[PDB]
Enzyme design. Structure first.
Site, PDB file in Angstrom:
ATOM      1  N   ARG A   1     -24.017 -26.564 -78.462  1.00  0.00           N
ATOM      2  CA  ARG A   1     -24.288 -25.681 -79.611  1.00  0.00           C
ATOM      3  C   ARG A   1     -25.740 -25.807 -80.142  1.00  0.00           C
ATOM      4  O   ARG A   1     -26.230 -24.890 -80.817  1.00  0.00           O
ATOM      5  CB  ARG A   1     -23.260 -25.928 -80.751  1.00  0.00           C
ATOM      6  CG  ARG A   1     -23.468 -27.246 -81.511  1.00  0.00           C
ATOM      7  CD  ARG A   1     -22.412 -27.540 -82.568  1.00  0.00           C
ATOM      8  NE  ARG A   1     -22.442 -28.954 -82.966  1.00  0.00           N
ATOM      9  CZ  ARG A   1     -21.812 -29.924 -82.304  1.00  0.00           C
ATOM     10  NH1 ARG A   1     -21.097 -29.643 -81.226  1.00  0.00           N
ATOM     11  NH2 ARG A   1     -21.897 -31.182 -82.714  1.00  0.00           N
TER      12      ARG A   1
ATOM     13  N   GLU B   1     -39.540 -19.773 -81.294  1.00  0.00           N
ATOM     14  CA  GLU B   1     -39.590 -19.114 -79.991  1.00  0.00           C
ATOM     15  C   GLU B   1     -38.219 -18.400 -79.792  1.00  0.00           C
ATOM     16  O   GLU B   1     -37.180 -19.036 -79.965  1.00  0.00           O
ATOM     17  CB  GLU B   1     -39.747 -20.260 -78.973  1.00  0.00           C
ATOM     18  CG  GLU B   1     -39.910 -19.889 -77.520  1.00  0.00           C
ATOM     19  CD  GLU B   1     -39.931 -21.083 -76.586  1.00  0.00           C
ATOM     20  OE1 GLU B   1     -39.640 -22.220 -77.026  1.00  0.00           O
ATOM     21  OE2 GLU B   1     -40.131 -20.856 -75.374  1.00  0.00           O
ATOM     22  N   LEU B   2     -38.220 -17.079 -79.501  1.00  0.00           N
ATOM     23  CA  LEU B   2     -36.970 -16.353 -79.287  1.00  0.00           C
ATOM     24  C   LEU B   2     -36.445 -16.677 -77.880  1.00  0.00           C
ATOM     25  O   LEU B   2     -37.103 -16.401 -76.873  1.00  0.00           O
ATOM     26  CB  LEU B   2     -37.122 -14.828 -79.526  1.00  0.00           C
ATOM     27  CG  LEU B   2     -35.858 -13.950 -79.318  1.00  0.00           C
ATOM     28  CD1 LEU B   2     -34.822 -14.144 -80.437  1.00  0.00           C
ATOM     29  CD2 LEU B   2     -36.235 -12.484 -79.208  1.00  0.00           C
ATOM     30  N   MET B   3     -35.290 -17.333 -77.827  1.00  0.00           N
ATOM     31  CA  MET B   3     -34.695 -17.757 -76.564  1.00  0.00           C
ATOM     32  C   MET B   3     -33.657 -16.725 -76.180  1.00  0.00           C
ATOM     33  O   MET B   3     -32.552 -16.748 -76.709  1.00  0.00           O
ATOM     34  CB  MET B   3     -34.135 -19.180 -76.727  1.00  0.00           C
ATOM     35  CG  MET B   3     -35.229 -20.212 -77.054  1.00  0.00           C
ATOM     36  SD  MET B   3     -36.127 -20.797 -75.596  1.00  0.00           S
ATOM     37  CE  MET B   3     -37.169 -19.552 -75.323  1.00  0.00           C
TER      38      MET B   3
ATOM     39  N   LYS C   1     -35.308 -18.431 -88.749  1.00  0.00           N
ATOM     40  CA  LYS C   1     -34.381 -19.298 -89.461  1.00  0.00           C
ATOM     41  C   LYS C   1     -34.727 -19.119 -90.949  1.00  0.00           C
ATOM     42  O   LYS C   1     -35.878 -19.317 -91.348  1.00  0.00           O
ATOM     43  CB  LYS C   1     -34.540 -20.754 -88.987  1.00  0.00           C
ATOM     44  CG  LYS C   1     -33.486 -21.687 -89.515  1.00  0.00           C
ATOM     45  CD  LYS C   1     -33.176 -22.813 -88.545  1.00  0.00           C
ATOM     46  CE  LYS C   1     -31.909 -23.540 -88.951  1.00  0.00           C
ATOM     47  NZ  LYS C   1     -30.708 -22.648 -88.931  1.00  0.00           N
TER      48      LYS C   1
ATOM     49  N   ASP D   1     -27.316 -35.480 -82.530  1.00  0.00           N
ATOM     50  CA  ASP D   1     -26.330 -34.440 -82.218  1.00  0.00           C
ATOM     51  C   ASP D   1     -26.660 -33.664 -80.945  1.00  0.00           C
ATOM     52  O   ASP D   1     -26.731 -32.434 -80.973  1.00  0.00           O
ATOM     53  CB  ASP D   1     -26.061 -33.494 -83.403  1.00  0.00           C
ATOM     54  CG  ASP D   1     -24.768 -32.699 -83.279  1.00  0.00           C
ATOM     55  OD1 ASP D   1     -23.915 -33.079 -82.457  1.00  0.00           O
ATOM     56  OD2 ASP D   1     -24.633 -31.681 -83.976  1.00  0.00           O
TER      57      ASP D   1
HETATM   58  C1  LIG Z   1     -32.202 -21.170 -85.028  1.00  0.00           C
HETATM   59  C2  LIG Z   1     -31.631 -20.516 -83.785  1.00  0.00           C
HETATM   60  O1  LIG Z   1     -32.745 -20.250 -82.933  1.00  0.00           O
HETATM   61  C3  LIG Z   1     -32.619 -19.268 -81.976  1.00  0.00           C
HETATM   62  C4  LIG Z   1     -31.494 -18.468 -81.823  1.00  0.00           C
HETATM   63  C5  LIG Z   1     -31.363 -17.648 -80.708  1.00  0.00           C
HETATM   64  C6  LIG Z   1     -32.423 -17.607 -79.808  1.00  0.00           C
HETATM   65  N1  LIG Z   1     -33.550 -18.320 -79.968  1.00  0.00           N
HETATM   66  C7  LIG Z   1     -33.650 -19.150 -81.032  1.00  0.00           C
HETATM   67  N2  LIG Z   1     -34.779 -19.865 -81.176  1.00  0.00           N
HETATM   68  C8  LIG Z   1     -30.067 -16.940 -80.456  1.00  0.00           C
HETATM   69  C9  LIG Z   1     -29.850 -15.648 -79.864  1.00  0.00           C
HETATM   70  C10 LIG Z   1     -30.869 -14.618 -79.443  1.00  0.00           C
HETATM   71  C11 LIG Z   1     -31.034 -14.277 -77.983  1.00  0.00           C
HETATM   72  C12 LIG Z   1     -30.419 -13.288 -78.891  1.00  0.00           C
HETATM   73  N3  LIG Z   1     -28.581 -15.410 -79.703  1.00  0.00           N
HETATM   74  N4  LIG Z   1     -27.933 -16.506 -80.160  1.00  0.00           N
HETATM   75  C13 LIG Z   1     -26.482 -16.569 -80.030  1.00  0.00           C
HETATM   76  C14 LIG Z   1     -28.790 -17.434 -80.659  1.00  0.00           C
HETATM   77  C15 LIG Z   1     -28.304 -18.723 -81.345  1.00  0.00           C
HETATM   78  N5  LIG Z   1     -28.235 -18.743 -82.801  1.00  0.00           N
HETATM   79  C16 LIG Z   1     -27.560 -17.618 -83.439  1.00  0.00           C
HETATM   80  C17 LIG Z   1     -28.703 -19.740 -83.579  1.00  0.00           C
HETATM   81  O2  LIG Z   1     -28.627 -19.718 -84.797  1.00  0.00           O
HETATM   82  C18 LIG Z   1     -29.262 -20.979 -82.936  1.00  0.00           C
HETATM   83  C19 LIG Z   1     -28.355 -21.796 -82.251  1.00  0.00           C
HETATM   84  C20 LIG Z   1     -28.755 -22.993 -81.694  1.00  0.00           C
HETATM   85  C21 LIG Z   1     -30.054 -23.374 -81.851  1.00  0.00           C
HETATM   86  F1  LIG Z   1     -30.453 -24.546 -81.295  1.00  0.00           F
HETATM   87  C22 LIG Z   1     -30.981 -22.618 -82.530  1.00  0.00           C
HETATM   88  C23 LIG Z   1     -30.600 -21.388 -83.078  1.00  0.00           C
END
Ligand SMILES: C[C@H]1Oc2cc(cnc2N)-c2c(C3CC3)nn(C)c2CN(C)C(=O)c2ccc(F)cc21
Length: 288
Positions: A148, A92-94, A45, A144
């Protein structure tokens, strides 16, 4: 700025500073969010280098908030990189990504007729209600709770859902920016927030899950939602939603906050739905 949680005060000095040289960006995921490496896989982030002082404090507050939680259904923070520009928050990468995109992209389709079942949805709901229960017993109001703002460990059956974003609780933007579709009447009318705020929002998240990622209050604008909800209007069951699941939603949407269940009751009810064959044997709709 300081932050208090679980009876303990913390500052930016308590954040785990990860040396910038140890961090490598891989790809943009969607300030920007990148996939990175520290080997530890991370979601990065970023704080835009061109930002207001309030944006900086907001970013610092978010780092403090996430770092102080310790729960299986709340995204982990590996550390931060604040001593170099742009500033980073390391999460943590989800691999499953956000819950909203997941539900929309993993909808049962003629090609994938059994991609998701009622049990997958109940497991996601339980996981978030477990995260919400931890926040409630620690007197933290999220503000919230929405698809999303949730993330998944992987796209597969052993996926674990977690609350991943704390930007709203951090802020405390205009009227058209308030997530009014996830807000109970006393929150959007009086600006009153309690543990019962998250209960209402959880009911809306339940609708998002069982609708398989649709936008709440289909075809209604924010003002129409405001007037609809104020007048006692509630969403209809999502397509093929079992009655016991919809009953959790309508109990979460009680006008009086005192009549809405706490998260221990929500978890008991979700658990009962998972045990109930009439619920879990119900086929999800197949999108054409
Ligand atoms: C800040 C961001 O965090 C992550 C974002 C991802 C995975 N893991 C974390 N920790 C991730 C991935 C990776 C698997 C490819 N694909 N997508 C679509 C996202 C989501 N996204 C772009 C965000 O901006 C997001 C959204 C919601 C949230 F609750 C935290 C985050």
């Amino acid at each position: 700025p300081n932050y208090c949680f679980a009876g303990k005060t913390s500052s930016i000095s308590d954040l785990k500073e990860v040396p910038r040289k140890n961090i490598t960006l891989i790809r943009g995921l969607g300030g920007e969010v990148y996939e990175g490496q520290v080997p530890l896989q991370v979601a990065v982030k970023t704080l835009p280098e061109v930002c207001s002082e309030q944006d900086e404090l907001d970013f610092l507050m978010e780092a403090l908030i996430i770092s102080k939680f310790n729960h299986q259904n709340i995204v982990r923070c590996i550390g931060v990189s604040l001593q170099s520009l742009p500033r980073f928050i390391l999460l943590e990468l989800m691999a499953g990504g956000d819950l909203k995109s997941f539900l929309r992209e993993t909808r049962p389709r003629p090609s994938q007729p059994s991609s998701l079942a009622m049990l997958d949805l109940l497991h996601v709901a339980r996981d978030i209600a477990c995260g919400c229960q931890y926040l409630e017993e620690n007197h933290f109001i999220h503000r919230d709770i929405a698809a999303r703002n949730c993330l998944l460990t992987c796209p597969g059956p052993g996926r674990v859902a977690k609350i991943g974003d704390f930007g709203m609780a951090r802020d405390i933007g205009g009227c058209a920016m308030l997530p009014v579709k996830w807000m109970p009447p006393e929150a959007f009318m009086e600006g009153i927030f309690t543990s019962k705020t998250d209960t209402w929002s959880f009911g809306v998240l339940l609708w998002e899950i069982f609708s398989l990622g649709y936008m709440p209050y289909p075809s209604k604008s924010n003002q129409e939602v405001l007037e609809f909800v104020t007048s006692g209007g509630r969403m209809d069951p999502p397509k093929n939603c079992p009655g016991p699941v919809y009953r959790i939603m309508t109990q979460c949407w009680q006008h009086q906050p005192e009549d809405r269940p706490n998260f221990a009751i929500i978890l008991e009810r979700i658990e009962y739905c998972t045990q109930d064959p009439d619920v879990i044997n119900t086929a999800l709709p197949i999108e054409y």
